[PDB]
Amino acid sequence: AAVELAVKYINDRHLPDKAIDVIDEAGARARLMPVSKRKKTVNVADIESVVARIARIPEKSVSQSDRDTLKNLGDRLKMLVFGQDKAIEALTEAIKMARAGLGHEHKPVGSFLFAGPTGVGKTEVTVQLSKALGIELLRFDMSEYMERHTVSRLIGAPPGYVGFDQGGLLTDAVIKHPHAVLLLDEIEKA
Amino acid sequence: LVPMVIEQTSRGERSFDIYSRLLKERVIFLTGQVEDHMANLIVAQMLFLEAENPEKDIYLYINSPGGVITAGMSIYDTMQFIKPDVSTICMGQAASMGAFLLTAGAKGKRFCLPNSRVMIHQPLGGYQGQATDIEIHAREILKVKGRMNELMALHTGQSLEQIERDTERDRFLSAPEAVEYGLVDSILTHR
Amino acid sequence: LVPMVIEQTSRGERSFDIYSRLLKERVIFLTGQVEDHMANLIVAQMLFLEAENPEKDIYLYINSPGGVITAGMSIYDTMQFIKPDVSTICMGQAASMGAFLLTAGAKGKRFCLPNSRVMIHQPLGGYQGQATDIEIHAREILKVKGRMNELMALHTGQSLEQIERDTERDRFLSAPEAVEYGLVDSILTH
C-alpha cells in the first residue's frame, strides 16, 4: 500500500526513495505515539496517516474509511446547494467510480461542461464539492485568455523570451496541488 | 433602407439585416411581383436552409400580387424537390401565382391570416405576330393552364373540372373560404 | 443620408442607424404610402421584437398618407397575432388604412398627438374591363369595405351603424374629436 498510495499522492519524488521515506516514517510514529506496550505491527491505517501529511491532504482521500462521505455526498450537497438534483447526482456517480477502481487509466477523474444559466449555482457546486472531498480549489478566468498570445501564460513562455522563469499558472497550480478541483468559467470566450 | 439587428454570440456581436436574421430562423419572404430574379433569390435561400438542417421545416411568407408563371415553377419545383416541408403563410393577399405557391406547401402546414385574401384566375399571357406563330404560342399557353389546374387539384384535392370552372374567370376567396375550398387546413390563430 | 448613432456597450462600441437604434428600444416608425415591401419590413421588425422580449410593449408611430388596403392587412394581422401590445402613436397624417392601424393598437395603449390629423374614408378602388369581370371585382371591394367596417367597430367600440354611416363620405377628424369617437384613448400628457 505504501508504494501504491505514495505514487498516487506523491509525484514529486521518485518511487524508490519515496517508498523508503513513508515506510521509515511510519516506524517513527510507533516510537512516540504509543504510551506503553502497544501494538508493534504497522497496519495499513498507520501508513495512510503519514503519507497524508507528506501530501498535505486531510487524510480523507487516501484513507479507506471515507466511504461514508462518498455514500452520502449527493444528499450532503443538496443541503448546501439545493436544486437540480440531476446535476448533483451526476457528479457523485463519476466520483464514486473514480475512487472505486473503475477510473480511467490516464484520463482525468472527470470532465464536465456545466451548460446552464447564471445563478443556478454552477460554480457553487464546485467550491462545495472541494470542501466535501477536502482538496484545493483552482479557479481560472477564461475571459482573460481571449487573445492568441494569452495561452502562453497558462503553460509558460518558451526559452529565450520573457516569462520563461515563470513555470505557468495552470502548470504550477496542478503540480503544487495534484489533488484539487479545476474550474474554468466562461470557457466559450476562451 | 433595411434595419440591422444584433444577435449576441460567445465570441462577438454579429450584425445582420432584418431579412437575413429571419432567414437564419428558416423564414423566407416572398414579396412583390414574381420574377426570374427575385425567384432565384427565393430558391437560393431554400437550398441553403436544406443543407443547414434537412429536418426543420421552412416558412415561406407570401404577400405577392402575382407575376410571371415561368419564374414561379422554379420556386414550386424547388419546394417539392427539397426534403424539408415548406410552410406557406398567406400575408395580405395571394394572387393566382401566389395562391399556387401557397397551396403547394406540405399538407397540414399551409395557413392564411383571418383577414388575408386569395385570388385565382387563368394566365393572362398574350402573344402577337403572324397567324402561324400565334397558333404555336396559343397551343402552349393552354398546356400551362391545364398543367396549373392539374397541380392545383392534387394539392387542393378538388377535381380537374372543378378547378377549371373556378379558374375560368377571376375569383376572390376569403380566408375562411380558403379552408372550405381546400387550399389550407385552417387559419393561423394558435400554434 | 440617415445618421449613424453610436451605442455604448460593455463589449465595445457599435455603429447603428437612427432607425436601427430605435428598433432596440421597441420603437418602430411607419411613413409613406403603404406598399408590399414596406409592410413586410414592419412585419419583420415586429417578429424580431416578439422573440427578444414578449412582455415589453412595442411602439409604432404612424405618419403615412394611406396606401393599398391588401398590404396593410399583413401589418394588422401581425400586430394582433404577436403577444406584445403594440402602441400606436399617430404623429401626423393618418388616412383610412393609416387610421386602421392606429385603431388596431392594444386597448389602453393607443395614442395621438394634439395637432395630429386623422381622416377615414371607405376603401377606394377601381377596375375596368368586361362586364362580367367588373362585377367580380365590384363584389370583392364591397366585401373588403364590410370587413374593414366590421373590424373598425370592434377595436373602436362604436356601433357598426355609425361606422358605416360616416365612412361613406370623406371625413376628417382632429385629435380631440377622436377621443369622442373612441378612435384613440387619449393624447400624450408629456
Ligand SMILES: Nc1ncnc2c1ncn2[C@@H]1O[C@H](COP(=O)(O)OP(=O)(O)O)[C@@H](O)[C@H]1O
Ligand atoms: N441553487 C443555488 N443554491 C444556492 N446558492 C445559489 C444557487 N444559485 C445561485 N446561488 C448563489 O449565487 C451566488 C453565485 O453562485 P455561483 O455558483 O458563483 O453562480 P454562477 O453559477 O451563476 O456563476 C452564490 O451566493 C451562490 O450561493
